[PDB]
Write a structure and sequence with these properties.
Chain A is an all-beta fold and 275 residues long. Chain A has one helix and 17 strands. The longest helix of chain A has 6 residues. The termini of chain B are far apart. The structure holds potassium ion and magnesium ion (198 copies). Chain A binds seven RNA strands through β12, α1 and β17.
RNA sequence: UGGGAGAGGGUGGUGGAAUUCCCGGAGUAGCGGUGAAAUGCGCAGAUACCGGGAGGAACGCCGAUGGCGAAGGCAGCCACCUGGUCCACCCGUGACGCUGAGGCGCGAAAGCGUGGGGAGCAAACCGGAUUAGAUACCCGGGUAGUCCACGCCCUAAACG
RNA sequence: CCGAGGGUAGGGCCCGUGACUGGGGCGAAGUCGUAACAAGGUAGCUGUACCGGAAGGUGCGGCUGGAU
RNA sequence: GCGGGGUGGAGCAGCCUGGUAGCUCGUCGGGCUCAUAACCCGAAGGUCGUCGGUUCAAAUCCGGCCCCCGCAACCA
RNA sequence: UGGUUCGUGGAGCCAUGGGGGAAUCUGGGCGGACCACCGCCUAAGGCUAAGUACUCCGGGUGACCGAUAGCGCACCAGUAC
RNA sequence: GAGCUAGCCCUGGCCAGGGUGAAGCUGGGGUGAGACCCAGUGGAGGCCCGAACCGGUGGGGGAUGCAAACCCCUCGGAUGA
RNA sequence: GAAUGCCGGCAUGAGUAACGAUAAAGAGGGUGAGAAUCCCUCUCGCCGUAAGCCCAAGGGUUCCUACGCAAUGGUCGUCAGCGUAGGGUUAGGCGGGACCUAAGGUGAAGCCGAAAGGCGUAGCCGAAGGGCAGCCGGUUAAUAUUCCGGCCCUUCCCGCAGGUGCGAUGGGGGGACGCUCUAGGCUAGGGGGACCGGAGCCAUGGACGAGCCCGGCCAGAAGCGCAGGGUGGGAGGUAGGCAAAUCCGCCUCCCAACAAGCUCUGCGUGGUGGGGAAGCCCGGGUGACAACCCCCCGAAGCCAGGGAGCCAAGAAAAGCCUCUAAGCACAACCUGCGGGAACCCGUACCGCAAACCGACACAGGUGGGCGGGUGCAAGAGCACUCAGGCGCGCGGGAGAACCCUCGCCAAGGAACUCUGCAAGUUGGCCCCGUAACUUCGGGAGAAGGGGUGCUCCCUGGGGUGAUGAGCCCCGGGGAGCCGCAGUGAACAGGCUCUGGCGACUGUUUACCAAAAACACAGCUCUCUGCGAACUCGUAAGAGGAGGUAUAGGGAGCGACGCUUGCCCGGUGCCGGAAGGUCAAGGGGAGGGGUGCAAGCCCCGAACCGAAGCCCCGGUGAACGGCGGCCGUAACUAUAACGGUCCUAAGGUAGCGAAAUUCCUUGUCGGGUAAGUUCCGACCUGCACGAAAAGCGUAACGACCGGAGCGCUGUCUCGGCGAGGGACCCGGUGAAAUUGAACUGGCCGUGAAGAUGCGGCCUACCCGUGGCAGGACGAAAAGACCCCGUGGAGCUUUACUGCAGCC
RNA sequence: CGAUGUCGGCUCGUCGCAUCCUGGGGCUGAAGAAGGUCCCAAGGGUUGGGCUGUUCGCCCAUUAAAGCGGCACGCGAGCUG
């Protein structure tokens, strides 16, 4: 569920917060966290390269295990489910029989106290990771590698998932969260199940401050600027666009496709995305 | 009101200091220029 | 106590025909639609045919004037959870009954909110016909919605 | 002390009245179409939704108070 | 101050590119109908805002006048 | 593309970022597209004084200045400020 | 040149007192179970009043100023973007 | 001789403005050539969440003392932050370094770039973060956690003894973390005391008092006590913690578990060492053998790594502990004890200011800590006042106009004015009471009203004690008293009704606009499959993001409610292995130059040939667009209806003389005695209309209209009073401006607005306080306007290029 | 154009007379009263409000009357804005 508030302040009227039902531990594993270096949207030249960023709550980065084929055949116990500020998902603490402790992003329905395992011979059950070829077609899957051994790159956001559509040679056909149909190598690992915390998208920030807490600084319309700043700048009083709607940098921003046509991965993308 | 000059000894030496000048081509040129002019001080005085 | 029939309800699964779309192959000059046509689609290779995929919705034959339910209503198949109901035995309790202002629940379709889903169908809308006109009936398209979950709405030729 | 009542302030109900507005009812022979009654020339009616000069039309469901 | 317009009864062609006034509706006459409308068959009706000039010839080209609608009128 | 007087010009020469890519004197470059003849020269390694430029420094000399001039400074000036 | 100023980064610090009384929890009522209602407890909030502090709304004064933006009275925010 | 020329000198304004907060002075006595100004005393006033004290920045000798007064000091000066000289800053424990990391910087390796250079993992550097051992008092003119006194403690080195598998930049634990609220116990701090100590005091009517005034502590090792933080023990297995490991991690077992124990801090006590007032005798002596106790209040500070709740999920690295590896086990480490060793820099003084930033001894600006008492509900608010610090570095008079700040006003009560601008009114707390409407929170402090002091009697519950007295915290009821008035002073909302805009809290034009603008949660479009898109960069490399379509970029719109119509012809974007065009290149029908020739060389048609464009489609919460004339109803008027021209399509719902209405003060209603505004209507909307959103909307607003109530000096309409100025005297003494001046009125004239010309009129010479009509007064080489083949910002389907992209 | 501050308001006047009232008149379609119209007359006077920034104007309530003009659309080193 998602938690609502009474309108006892204007902002509290619409604000909703996560229910945190699945969270069983309220501090992270000290050895599995490093300090996150806030950027403020600045790159190594000290230049804003992504606008409207900074000032959000301090965060500690939880090291996430996006490989899992490290520990093939070694099962683990789902010891806890915790809060991670760096992603939309929840993260599950694993205590391996190995003694090793790692984080994975927590899949939906995954339960504290259960066992999980990785490998070709692993059971087809939630929280287990296998290479795609050994997973039944039509099964829902998340945290999918894009290339073998390169790390889980796909369907990692809260509520996201991919579906295996079929097989073609050394490649399988996935339906990514975007709806795009794609050829992913068979030897790519993925976890059966969907990413948990599906109710994430039902969160209503409620007020400006909530945006600031997230390190999302105020976004200012080009229309509100001057011609020096932005193609939509200027005009006496309000103005319509007066040209094709565009970015500050002048390129068109309504429909203008921008992926490189000659991209080598185009051979592996069967169908462009959905809606 | 609050004015523009807010003395700070560390800031002075770190910005205009001799070692700062030397670290950069333009700053060395400053030192060169100031030496050629016969400046009695090449770099602002600051008490460390 | 023993037994029966049933689309009664809810949950999860799952099967084939068909429609559409997409890919591949073969193939050519029309297909489609109608009262007749036009729009539309089609040499940028459509229609018709075979193979491949994806997906959604509805369950043909059984099927009946049939069965279930208090009504609204309920139909591929499997399993799990559950209501009502009939019969038989003549075993138990002994009027514990009937109705029911209010209350409370259920309530087709359409509609509404937040998500998902969207093949076919289709308000609105567009176009082509018809026509004096045609904001219609017919035709080519087409958005809500139809579908799912949760929450509302609580109307009806809710009729026997 | 209580106290008719006067005063101050804010409420409740009722009645009259108001530029304008909304449909309604009636009004011998007004304009437009022809929706319903015979399969009324698209069977009707209907709850709801959307639309249109108007009757009305269309969608989804329902009913026969419809078929011959 | 600037543009466009005026033509059978109504609305629009023709003007640019001189000679040839046309389309739809309306109006009249006849049909069908019990009758009207629709529909069908025929027919009329303009001499082109007005005056002038060019031309062999002016709706058409040029000029003036009446008109008819639009647009402008800023710096203070 | 650059250099030369040469700004695409009939544009050779010299230099070279890219593609193709020889020969060793019967080899090769040049003589202003090109070709023939007549000639000039010997690429793709390097070094080389002197004659030339300059004046921080020393000296010599002015139809140079003479303290608002002459150097920003005749003086404790790249100072005080 | 970011010792002013604008943003961001890292590490610290500050915010008197009062007011309001969300969720939750408990108890009670309710029901087949519920939803729900009550009371207490609780102490939420770009919540309220108001200093520090951050502002600079209206007015007056100042105007070769106390000041190249100041003074008085007033007023905004004051657990938060 | 002029360049608003340049440098300098000196005038004018002028003995003029001013002499820098209106916190405030007076007298006596000193000093001295000279004193309102320096010193001393007394009186007065001001600050006291500072205007007192401490610390950090910054400043740099300004500190102390002596001797001085030319200049500095807005006057004066004998004084000084001034001149000259002398003296002054003392640390193993405070701060910083010989420790650690943070952002960032730098940078082995490495990567990149014409050069200069840019990057970059480890490492290093880098602090107000972490870590780390000193507290009290005395002393100097001037330093003190630094010197001295007492009581403590840290590191390093060596030696001794006991113990031990010792050993690290390696492993592991730990360090180690937010915000709000908050328990228990303490302290800091405070109040009271009939107790204890203390010079004295009896005034002026009373008081020899259980009277007044003063003070009644501070530091302290081990130990003990109180309160609290931290921590389970044992074994077996082990495959992870890049080697190892007995450690940590994981599994299993037993024992026990808001206990205890062990450990670590705070606090109290504590051997000991200190300190100690008023008053009157000259910073000192005394008081004093000072006493040094009880009760109460009590932190935001301490135990502190406490607890709870919450979502936005809250540094690192060392010190430290543990583990093992090389090694090594004569070593080595641990523990205790002893001795020795312990360096560098800062240390003065100012430090909300006269020593810092502001050119000034400048009403400005400047981070942290302490900041007492009484009362007012509280408090850091407010008034007074302690400690302490000040009266602001020109004065003395006078008592005009006028200005500032201030107080009061009869009758009226907004009639003032663009505006109730400004100023009134209201004003805290307790109680009673409180409407439309609403998103059920609110609107609410709505409105509106009552209460408020003091004295006596009775009484209820709590904290601390003990369950009690005393102290302290909330109270409740009686009966009374005084005043014009009881939150008696100070601080402390005026209210309401109704529209426009924006939902809301927020944000902005530093220094003329705070708004209706910006932001905003929310909505929708669009891009992006991850070496993402996009951004910065030549690049490498970064951001994006250690994120992955419930994510990220872009754009519009702007909570929420109900909605968001038709036009795809044009532009945009998206789709379209056809066709048309199309560059280099491929091709070489065919020519041409030259050569005696092979040959060399030049040109060259058809055809093949990419994107782009053309072309076929799609597309609006993409750029955008959403008609005209004419006729018709059994009165008129109007036109549901019809005809016709054009369009890509002809503006839907809603709303409308509007933040939009030209005509316009439209019309009609409302409110008013009167309403160019306002509110409500109407609709021929010059020129609304649906995400440059349309129409609504509770709540919110230092926004902008309109109205009423309250109340007022805004006004009728002005009067009086106060103080700071203006004025006089002493002191110091500017400025812009200035062709020179011996500088009148009228009517004329004149380049068209004359002190300056004409004629006339008027006029003794020179000032002071005032006024502002003129000197086309000052200031600023007009910012409007034009001009210039002047400049710059900005735009685009202007031109031509460049990046980027294809 | 090396600046002659620009509407209106306020304040302060002063002037002209084409006289709004008061005073003196002629003519009247002047019976009286009250008017109309002209002439002489500038001495004095010429109100307070609603609306607009408004000048002007309309409206309210009065009045003997509610005059029109000039003075840089009088007057910003007088003020307002
Ligand atoms: K202008
Ligand atoms: Mg909510
Ligand atoms: Mg969760
Ligand atoms: Mg760590
Ligand atoms: Mg860097
Ligand atoms: Mg840099
Ligand atoms: Mg960006
Ligand atoms: Mg940014
Ligand atoms: Mg999370
Ligand atoms: Mg955040
Ligand atoms: Mg924005
Ligand atoms: Mg702008
Ligand atoms: Mg810029
Ligand atoms: Mg631009
Ligand atoms: Mg624009
Ligand atoms: Mg506009
Ligand atoms: Mg604009
Ligand atoms: Mg554009
Ligand atoms: Mg791009
Ligand atoms: Mg795709
Ligand atoms: Mg300065
Ligand atoms: Mg410093
Ligand atoms: Mg510093
Ligand atoms: Mg610094
Ligand atoms: Mg430096
Ligand atoms: Mg020197
Ligand atoms: Mg220098
Ligand atoms: Mg073909
Ligand atoms: Mg029986
Ligand atoms: Mg019996
Ligand atoms: Mg339904
Ligand atoms: Mg229903
Ligand atoms: Mg009475
Ligand atoms: Mg019908
Ligand atoms: Mg009919
Ligand atoms: Mg019909
Ligand atoms: Mg019909
Ligand atoms: Mg019928
Ligand atoms: Mg119509
Ligand atoms: Mg229809
Ligand atoms: Mg029938
Ligand atoms: Mg023509
Ligand atoms: Mg012709
Ligand atoms: Mg008959
Ligand atoms: Mg007929
Ligand atoms: Mg002729
Ligand atoms: Mg003729
Ligand atoms: Mg003709
Ligand atoms: Mg202009
Ligand atoms: Mg040439
Ligand atoms: Mg050449
Ligand atoms: Mg040649
Ligand atoms: Mg080359
Ligand atoms: Mg050769
Ligand atoms: Mg050569
Ligand atoms: Mg040659
Ligand atoms: Mg030659
Ligand atoms: Mg040669
Ligand atoms: Mg050679
Ligand atoms: Mg030489
Ligand atoms: Mg000479
Ligand atoms: Mg000489
Ligand atoms: Mg000189
Ligand atoms: Mg000279
Ligand atoms: Mg020299
Ligand atoms: Mg000189
Ligand atoms: Mg110097
Ligand atoms: Mg900064
Ligand atoms: Mg700074
Ligand atoms: Mg508080
Ligand atoms: Mg509080
Ligand atoms: Mg609170
Ligand atoms: Mg607040
Ligand atoms: Mg403070
Ligand atoms: Mg102010
Ligand atoms: Mg005010
Ligand atoms: Mg002023
Ligand atoms: Mg100023
Ligand atoms: Mg001030
Ligand atoms: Mg406040
Ligand atoms: Mg001259
Ligand atoms: Mg001058
Ligand atoms: Mg003088
Ligand atoms: Mg003077
Ligand atoms: Mg001064
Ligand atoms: Mg002074
Ligand atoms: Mg003295
Ligand atoms: Mg002196
Ligand atoms: Mg001297
Ligand atoms: Mg002096
Ligand atoms: Mg002096
Ligand atoms: Mg001074
Ligand atoms: Mg002396
Ligand atoms: Mg010491
Ligand atoms: Mg050493
Ligand atoms: Mg370091
Ligand atoms: Mg570097
Ligand atoms: Mg450094
Ligand atoms: Mg440090
Ligand atoms: Mg220390
Ligand atoms: Mg100590
Ligand atoms: Mg060991
Ligand atoms: Mg941490
Ligand atoms: Mg919080
Ligand atoms: Mg406590
Ligand atoms: Mg006290
Ligand atoms: Mg192991
Ligand atoms: Mg190991
Ligand atoms: Mg003694
Ligand atoms: Mg505890
Ligand atoms: Mg804690
Ligand atoms: Mg680190
Ligand atoms: Mg040995
Ligand atoms: Mg040991
Ligand atoms: Mg050393
Ligand atoms: Mg010291
Ligand atoms: Mg301070
Ligand atoms: Mg000082
Ligand atoms: Mg002073
Ligand atoms: Mg000062
Ligand atoms: Mg108080
Ligand atoms: Mg003073
Ligand atoms: Mg006087
Ligand atoms: Mg009065
Ligand atoms: Mg009154
Ligand atoms: Mg008023
Ligand atoms: Mg006035
Ligand atoms: Mg105003
Ligand atoms: Mg007003
Ligand atoms: Mg008050
Ligand atoms: Mg009240
Ligand atoms: Mg009293
Ligand atoms: Mg108040
Ligand atoms: Mg209005
Ligand atoms: Mg706004
Ligand atoms: Mg606002
Ligand atoms: Mg703004
Ligand atoms: Mg501003
Ligand atoms: Mg500005
Ligand atoms: Mg400025
Ligand atoms: Mg202002
Ligand atoms: Mg504001
Ligand atoms: Mg908003
Ligand atoms: Mg929205
Ligand atoms: Mg770039
Ligand atoms: Mg990253
Ligand atoms: Mg906005
Ligand atoms: Mg907007
Ligand atoms: Mg509503
Ligand atoms: Mg279009
Ligand atoms: Mg199109
Ligand atoms: Mg288009
Ligand atoms: Mg639209
Ligand atoms: Mg267009
Ligand atoms: Mg429409
Ligand atoms: Mg209107
Ligand atoms: Mg308009
Ligand atoms: Mg108007
Ligand atoms: Mg009017
Ligand atoms: Mg009027
Ligand atoms: Mg009216
Ligand atoms: Mg107005
Ligand atoms: Mg009208
Ligand atoms: Mg728009
Ligand atoms: Mg729009
Ligand atoms: Mg509206
Ligand atoms: Mg509202
Ligand atoms: Mg406001
Ligand atoms: Mg007055
Ligand atoms: Mg006075
Ligand atoms: Mg002097
Ligand atoms: Mg003249
Ligand atoms: Mg003159
Ligand atoms: Mg003369
Ligand atoms: Mg003369
Ligand atoms: Mg004057
Ligand atoms: Mg003047
Ligand atoms: Mg100039
Ligand atoms: Mg000029
Ligand atoms: Mg100028
Ligand atoms: Mg001009
Ligand atoms: Mg010219
Ligand atoms: Mg130019
Ligand atoms: Mg001018
Ligand atoms: Mg002037
Ligand atoms: Mg001017
Ligand atoms: Mg008479
Ligand atoms: Mg008569
Ligand atoms: Mg007469
Ligand atoms: Mg007169
Ligand atoms: Mg007026
Ligand atoms: Mg005027
Ligand atoms: Mg007017
Ligand atoms: Mg009279
Ligand atoms: Mg005029
Ligand atoms: Mg004027
Ligand atoms: Mg002025
Ligand atoms: Mg004026
Ligand atoms: Mg103004």
């Amino acid at each position: 569920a998602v938690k609502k508030f009474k309108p006892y302040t204007p902002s509290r009227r619409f604000m909703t917060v996560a229910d945190f039902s699945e969270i069983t531990k309220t501090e992270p594993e000290k050895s599995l966290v490093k300090p996150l270096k806030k950027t403020g949207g600045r790159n190594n030249q000290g230049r804003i390269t992504v606008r409207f960023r900074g000032g959000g709550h301090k965060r500690l980065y939880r090291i996430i295990d996006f490989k899992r084929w490290d520990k093939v055949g070694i099962p683990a116990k789902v010891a806890a489910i915790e809060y991670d500020p760096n992603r939309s998902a929840r993260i599950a603490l694993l205590h391996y029989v190995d003694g090793e402790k790692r984080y994975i992003i927590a899949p939906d329905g995954l339960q504290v106290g259960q066992q999980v395992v990785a490998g070709p011979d692993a059971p087809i059950q939630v929280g287990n990771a296998l290479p795609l070829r050994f997973i039944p077609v039509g099964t829902v899957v998340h945290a999918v590698e894009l290339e073998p051994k390169k790390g889980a790159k796909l369907a990692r956001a809260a509520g996201t998932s991919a579906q295996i559509q079929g097989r073609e040679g050394d490649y399988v056909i996935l339906r990514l969260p975007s709806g795009e149909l794609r050829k992913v190598h068979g030897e790519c690992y993925a976890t059966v199940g969907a990413v948990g915390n599906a109710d994430h998208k039902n969160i209503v920030l409620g007020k400006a401050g909530r945006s600031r807490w997230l390190g999302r600084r105020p976004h200012v319309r080009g229309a509100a600027m001057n011609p020096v700043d932005h193609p939509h700048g200027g005009g006496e009083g309000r103005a319509p666009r007066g040209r094709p709607p565009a970015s500050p940098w002048g390129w068109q921003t309504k429909g203008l496709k921008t992926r490189k046509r000659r991209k080598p991965s185009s051979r592996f993308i069967i169908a462009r995305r959905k809606k | 009101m609050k004015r523009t000059w807010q003395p700070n000894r560390r800031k002075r030496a770190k910005t205009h200091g001799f070692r700062a000048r030397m670290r950069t081509p333009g700053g060395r040129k400053v030192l060169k220029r100031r030496r050629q002019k016969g400046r009695w001080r090449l770099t602002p005085a600051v008490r460390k």
